[PDB]
């Protein structure tokens, strides 16, 4: 719940993520606003060239009912995908570390 920022468009979500003092891996789920139905997880990241930047993901539906970034990895809530993602990165830019702050 704490990550879900629901109707939160892709720029927004930047805007709060770019905020200089969230540790990398600062992250929030959202609806997409592209794909109707689909999510994202929207996550902080950074490099020694471009600096701070958000990388998106999209989450997308499965026919089960189930969420997706890849294919081969399947969860049955964001909840799960959110747990799965923190655990380790598995593929993401970064593990996620920390909600995305107010």
Known sequence: E???FGKITRRESERLLL?????RGTFL??????????YCLSVSDFDNAKGLNVKHYK???????????????????LQQLVAYYSKHA???CHRLTNVCPT
């Open 29 to 38: 789920v959202r609806e997409s606003e592209t794909t109707k139905g689909a």
């Open 90 to 92: 598995d593929g993401l």
């Open 2 to 4: 704490e990550w879900y």
């Open 19 to 23: 905020n200089p003092e969230n540790p």
């Open 59 to 77: 989450i997308r539906k499965l026919d089960s009912g189930g969420f997706y970034i890849t294919s081969r990895t399947q969860f049955s809530s």
